[PDB]
Design a binder for this molecule. Structure first.
Ligand SMILES: Nc1ncnc2c1ncn2[C@@H]1O[C@H](CSCC[C@H](N)C(=O)O)[C@@H](O)[C@H]1O
Ligand SMILES: [Zn+2]
Lengths: 128, 48, 226, 49, 223, 425, 8, 141, 46
């Protein structure tokens, strides 16, 4: 059990994977060309879609989850009436908070600006 | 992390793609498959 | 030449000249035997001690269903050697890549497993070791372990390399074909491209299928192929 | 008439009910399966129930 | 500008007046678009049976915060992909979406359709080079090619013994299968795999793999 | 203050674990958030990689998929989830021929050995990170030399009773007539002892809902057993049924500082003898360790509870930190004293300080006797451990168990001392 | 659905 | 005609809602795979047992392979076929101890969500639409 | 009001053999951006 050398320090067997794992070499690689996809997903809003499902994974009844979200969203707007009207939505703020409560990081209410917007009067036309 | 898909090599058709969507939903969930459908939709439209 | 040291053990019980479809009451020590795992059966060949597990003793062999203790006697169909030889063991089979049903979460989308139908034991030339600089495989002596029949035989090998038994073994190229039944030795310079091998087999198959499809037309007898 | 008062109607009606249940679902599924329509038995058993 | 930010995050319900399924009414995130017509996703137009010879939908905006909650969390298309009738997908690609995928996976011409006479191809170290060569018009979509496979055996082919095994006298033996080449050795355990496929199969496989990785990176729970 | 001017470039016993340890799990959809695995002479352990800022609800720390675990029902019939035993396999007959309530560890040991034999099972890889026969601290592996030094006739008798039960089970089910698929699982009697030791020291019983079925499973979760034990844990185990993921969640509203160890309570409340019997370790701060005492002398526990800022019902005894300010003395050890010490209390009857002072010395007069009963002192044992350099780890644990018990007696001696004088104010 | 019980 | 049939179908079961977890019934519809294959395909026989909640334990010798109130997946169903068991009793809407509602276990696993159905689901209306929707989808001798 | 200017908005180097870069060109009149993007893509690839 306990083993020490002359200096008095403790020497222990470094537990290491003796055998070899096939899947280890087949899964550590990452694709290099998803920069446009990840940017599109965030801009579209599918990042919340995964978060919405993730919350439902730890839930027992999806009808109770939406009632709890609606109840908490109503609580948010009552406290701060002049915050959840435009770029920030009461429901999205609840969802962002509930994800942040799990220990992950999301922007507040999933709100995103347009860094490339030229002027105040220029609104982004959508290419249908 | 590399995804452990299956390299479909012969052909895919209406029945083959329908099975693949079913397996993707049952393995990755609807949020992943919803994004996969959009990529598949773009790929099918582009190559058509 | 280069005969391996013909040592003798204490548990050696020769199974030569025994009935095939009969079991042996006793149980063998797996440490003393080569364990060959195939799809339908597990094959045991006596393993004489050696620095590398290359020496085979075909004097006593046993076949059992996969992962089972009831040993039997394989259906020997060839004059197996009575001396220790070094054989290179290479399996022969197919990959059964299947898509299992998904019920539990995160179940694998595919299940890739390799099924072994035959195992080839290629004798080293003059029983030379792998580490020997003059190592070369003697393709004349090849033994096939068939899982379906639970039998072991000797490969019927056709040598087409000019030079006879005195040829240079370094230019040999064994060409296994027809479900591991046709063994042909050709010069390495005559190796077919893998693309050619695939296209050649596809051309033969589709040509026969096309002819059968066209055979039902009533002007087939007065038509040409092109 | 074979069984008594508390069980002549108890299991007699149950036999009619149970036999009708399997018969009804088979006939309904016969139409949809013939036309290549896949519907789970749950959606039909609820109607039959 | 106020309208653009107002609709942001506020789902609306799209209803087909000749309603057909449970998907006849569904919720989408509206985006302000040009013109005077309602653009709709091609996939959801099959759930609505929305033919494009003429159709008009009724759109309703939930007002109460409870209604907006359940519109976003219960009626969105990303959470209703399986038909309750049997549990089968509803947003399956159809029409020219299915045609394009079929053409991609319609691989090489085989046998007598590929060679005029009885015989009696490029090697790509990775899928990126195969795609890149296709972009540079070096190879066609259906032209056969060999892909150096670094993963495990993954392609779905009929379970058959190798067509031909080229067993060299030095211990290296190549196993030519109907769809891939495997280079094993006796001295070593290299296990080199080369897949005989097309750009189309690679493009289809890469599209699925990139979609998964792109979705995973965007939803970076690791950080 | 620029980064170039700033030049940033202890705990030597703890080294970062093998990266393959997390990698072999990471490929199997195992995610650890904000934590890292460190190993040392004591063993493995999970330590925070960053400050865990508290949130409204519990924060997810680790996730383990169901397919990576070994699970067996606590109640007959014995059904294995992520089913690994094939139908008709002889190992099921061995498992099914066990005591329904006493041989839970044996049934897990058979599965543990069976899993190591399976080539596709994940535990054949994770088994390399399990402690060996010498590294494991379970008392089931200890010999008479460590058991005699343990100095506990009740605990030694129980341990030696288990050793006979485990060894005889191996003899019955691993004779010469077993199939090779069973014989190779336990080639020698010693290995099966190690298998039971791992099963006892790493089983995590929990009520989990798998699909539509709810049951109690003697689980063998990997990466979650590595969490050490503490009666005041900073995290707990939560089973998520929808995706069959076992979540390790830090307590809600609790901050975890950088480098702090993440711990869970293996048992809700138990004495050190139970922990030694099951897990082979003891804690001097156990709030459930007892000691026989004569009922003739007793004190007013309400005064005793308040003087150390202990509040709540006896089922929920705990200490308040900010009220005490610093109070480095008070810990979980003195909380056990509030239960095991003979006490008296009326509705609101104040105590007599002189009578308690008459009894505190009388109480402490007895307290010196138990320490005299053990020939060695508390500091003598720990001094021996530092001087010791070649011995089995079970010997060290046996030293620790009697050392912790002696300190538990030593702790209450000081506890009564400070309590007696503080009663005046 | 969401109206089951009384939302609590 | 199909649209008219939808209204009648939804009306008869408009009140059916999943309101209880387990109704506590003990009776279960027994299905055997050996007396059935003579008439219908085996593939559809799997679908009848997919998403069902088992009403009684299933044994293969002394080995227990499934338990009461355990959901049936393709893995369990295929096991029954391979080993040729016949005493398979499952919970169905026929076996629920109610007619104004249905419990989660008696109904089974929701096809849409791939898990046990959640309380409050308007499962009756879903059943009505699941039959009426294919309404607009319904020689050589 | 503005002049036609370009800028690099994103630049990543997550390898020694994989560089990423995103560039913006603005303002552009209607129909010009597609022409520039198509021709630049052809020049970049071959
Ligand atoms: N709080 C604690 N104090 C001391 N040892 C502990 C402990 N919690 C766990 N252990 C040790 O761990 C065993 C239980 S299994 C826990 C995994 C182990 N800590 C490891 O590093 O691999 C106990 O038998 C004991 O030896
Ligand atoms: Zn019921």
């Amino acid at each position: 059990g306990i083993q020490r050398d002359d200096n008095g320090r403790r020497i222990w067997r470094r537990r290491t994977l003796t055998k070899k794992d096939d899947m280890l070499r087949y899964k550590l690689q990452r694709v290099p060309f998803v920069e446009e996809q990840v940017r599109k997903i965030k801009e579209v809003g599918k990042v919340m879609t995964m978060d919405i499902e993730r919350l439902l994974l730890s839930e027992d009844n999806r009808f109770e989850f939406v009632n709890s979200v609606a109840a908490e969203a109503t609580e948010y707007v009552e406290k701060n009436r002049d915050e959840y009207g435009g770029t920030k939505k009461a429901i999205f703020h609840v969802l962002s908070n509930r994800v942040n409560d799990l220990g992950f990081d999301r922007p507040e209410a999933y709100a995103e600006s347009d860094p490339y917007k030229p002027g105040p009067g220029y609104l982004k036309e959508y290419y249908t | 992390e590399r995804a452990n898909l299956v390299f479909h090599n012969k052909v895919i058709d209406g029945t083959a793609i329908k099975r693949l969507i079913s397996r993707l939903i049952d393995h990755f969930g609807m949020a992943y498959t919803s994004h996969i459908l959009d990529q598949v939709k773009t790929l099918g439209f582009q190559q058509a | 030449d280069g005969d391996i040291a013909f040592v003798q053990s204490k548990s050696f019980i020769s199974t030569q000249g025994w009935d095939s479809e009969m079991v042996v009451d006793y149980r063998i020590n797996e440490d003393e035997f080569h364990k060959i795992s195939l799809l339908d059966c597990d094959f045991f060949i006596r393993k004489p001690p050696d620095p590398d597990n290359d020496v085979y003793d075909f004097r006593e062999m046993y076949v059992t269903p996969p992962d089972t203790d009831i040993y039997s006697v394989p259906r020997v169909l060839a004059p197996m050697p009575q001396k220790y030889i070094r054989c290179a063991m290479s399996d022969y089979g197919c990959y059964d890549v299947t898509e299992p049903p998904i019920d539990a979460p995160r179940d694998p989308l595919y299940k890739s497993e390799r099924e072994i139908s035959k195992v080839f034991l290629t004798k080293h030339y003059r029983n030379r070791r792998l580490n020997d600089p003059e190592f070369v495989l003697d393709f004349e002596e090849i033994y096939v372990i068939d899982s379906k029949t639970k039998s072991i035989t000797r490969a019927r090998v056709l040598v087409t390399v000019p030079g006879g038994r005195k040829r240079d073994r370094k230019d040999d190229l064994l060409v296994i074909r027809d479900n591991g039944n046709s063994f042909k030795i050709i010069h390495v310079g005559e190796r077919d491209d893998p693309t050619t091998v695939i296209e050649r087999e596809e051309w033969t198959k589709t040509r026969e299928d096309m002819e059968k499809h066209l055979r039902k037309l009533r002007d087939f007898s007065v038509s040409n192929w092109f | 008439r074979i069984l008594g008062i508390p069980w002549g109607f108890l299991i007699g009606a149950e036999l009619t009910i149970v036999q009708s249940r399997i018969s009804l679902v088979n006939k309904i599924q016969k139409v949809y399966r013939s036309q290549g329509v896949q519907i789970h038995n749950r959606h039909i058993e609820i109607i039959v129930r | 500008e106020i309208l653009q930010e107002v609709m942001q995050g506020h789902p609306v319900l799209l209803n087909r007046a000749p309603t057909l399924h449970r998907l006849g009414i569904q919720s989408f995130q509206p985006i302000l678009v040009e013109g005077r017509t309602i653009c709709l996703h091609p996939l959801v137009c099959k759930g609505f049976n929305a033919d494009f010879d003429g159709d008009q939908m009724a759109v309703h905006v939930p007002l109460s915060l409870e209604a907006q909650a359940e519109a976003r969390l219960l009626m969105f298309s990303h959470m209703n992909l399986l038909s309750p009738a049997i549990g089968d997908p509803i947003s399956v690609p159809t029409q020219d979406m299915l045609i394009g995928l079929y053409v991609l996976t319609s691989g090489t011409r085989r046998g007598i359709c590929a060679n005029r006479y009885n015989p009696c191809e490029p090697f790509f170290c990775n899928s990126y080079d195969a795609i890149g060569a296709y972009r540079q018009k070096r190879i066609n979509l259906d032209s056969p090619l060999w892909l150096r496979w670094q993963l495990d055996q993954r392609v779905i082919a009929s379970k058959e013994v190798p067509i031909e095994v080229h067993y060299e006298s030095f211990g290296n033996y190549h196993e030519i299968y109907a769809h891939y080449l495997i280079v094993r050795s006796v001295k070593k355990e290299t296990l080199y795999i080369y897949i005989r496929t097309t750009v189309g199969h690679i493009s289809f496989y890469r599209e699925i793999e990139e979609a998964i990785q792109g979705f995973s990176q965007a939803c970076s729970y690791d950080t | 203050p620029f980064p170039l001017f700033q030049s940033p470039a202890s705990s030597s016993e703890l080294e970062s674990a093998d990266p393959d340890f997390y990698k072999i799990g990471y490929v199997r959809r195992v995610r650890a958030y904000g934590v890292e695995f460190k190993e040392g002479p004591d063993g493995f352990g999970i330590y925070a990689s960053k400050d865990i800022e508290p949130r409204r609800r519990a924060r997810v720390i680790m996730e383990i998929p169901h397919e990576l675990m070994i699970t067996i029902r606590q109640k007959h019939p014995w059904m294995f989830f992520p089913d690994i035993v094939p139908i008709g396999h002889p190992i099921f007959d061995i498992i099914n021929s066990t005591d329904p309530e006493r041989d839970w560890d044996l049934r897990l040991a058979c599965l543990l050995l069976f899993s190591f034999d399976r080539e596709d099972h994940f535990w054949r890889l994770y088994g390399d990170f399990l402690p060996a026969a010498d590294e494991c601290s379970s008392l089931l592996l200890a010999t008479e030399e460590d058991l005699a030094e343990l100095q506990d006739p009740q605990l030694v008798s129980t341990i030696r009773q288990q050793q006979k039960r485990v060894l005889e089970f191996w003899e019955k089910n691993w004779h010469s007539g077993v199939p090779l698929k069973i014989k190779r699982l336990a080639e020698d009697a010693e290995r099966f002892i190690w298998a039971v030791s791992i099963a006892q020291t790493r089983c995590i019983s929990m009520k989990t809902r798998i699909g539509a079925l709810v049951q109690d499973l003697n689980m063998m979760i990997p990466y979650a057993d590595m969490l050490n034990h503490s009666f005041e844990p900073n995290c707990f185990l939560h089973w998520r049924p929808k995706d069959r993921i076992l979540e390790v969640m830090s307590n809600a509203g609790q901050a975890i500082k950088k480098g702090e160890e993440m711990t869970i309570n293996y048992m809700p409340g138990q004495k050190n003898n139970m922990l030694m019997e099951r897990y082979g370790f003891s804690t001097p701060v156990n709030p459930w360790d007892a000691i026989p005492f004569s009922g003739d002398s007793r004190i007013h526990l309400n005064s005793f509870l308040s003087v150390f800022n202990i509040f709540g019902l006896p089922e929920e005894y705990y200490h308040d930190s900010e009220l005490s300010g610093d109070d480095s003395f008070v810990d979980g050890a003195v909380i056990a004293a509030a239960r095991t010490l003979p006490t008296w209390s009326d509705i609101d009857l104040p105590p007599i300080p002189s009578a308690e002072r008459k009894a505190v010395k009388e109480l402490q007069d007895e307290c010196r006797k138990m320490l005299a009963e053990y020939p060695t002192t508390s500091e003598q044992d720990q001094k021996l451990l530092d001087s010791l350099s070649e011995a089995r780890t079970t010997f060290a644990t046996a030293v620790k168990y009697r050392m912790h018990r002696k300190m538990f007696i030593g702790k209450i001696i000081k506890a009564l001392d400070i309590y007696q004088e503080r009663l005046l104010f | 659905g969401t109206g089951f019980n009384k939302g609590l | 005609d199909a649209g008219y049939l939808t209204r009648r179908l939804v009306e008869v079961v408009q009140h059916i809602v999943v309101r209880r977890t387990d109704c506590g019934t003990i009776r279960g519809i027994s299905v055997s795979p050996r007396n059935k294959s003579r008439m219908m395909s085996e593939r559809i026989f799997i679908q009848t047992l997919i998403g069902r909640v088992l009403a009684d334990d299933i044994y293969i010798g002394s080995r227990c392979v499934a338990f009461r109130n355990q959901d049936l997946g393709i893995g369990l169903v295929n096991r029954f076929i391979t080993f040729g068991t016949q005493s398979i009793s499952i919970r169905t809407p026929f076996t629920c101890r109610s007619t104004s509602w249905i419990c989660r276990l008696c109904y089974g696993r929701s096809p849409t969500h791939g898990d046990l159905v959640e309380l409050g689901e308007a499962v009756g209306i879903i059943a009505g639409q699941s039959i009426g929707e294919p309404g607009t989808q319904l020689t050589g001798g | 009001t503005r002049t036609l200017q370009w800028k690099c908005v994103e630049s990543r180097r997550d390898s020694k053999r994989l560089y990423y870069g995103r560039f913006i060109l603005s303002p552009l009149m209607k129909g010009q951006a597609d022409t520039i993007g198509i021709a630049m893509r052809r020049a970049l690839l071959g």
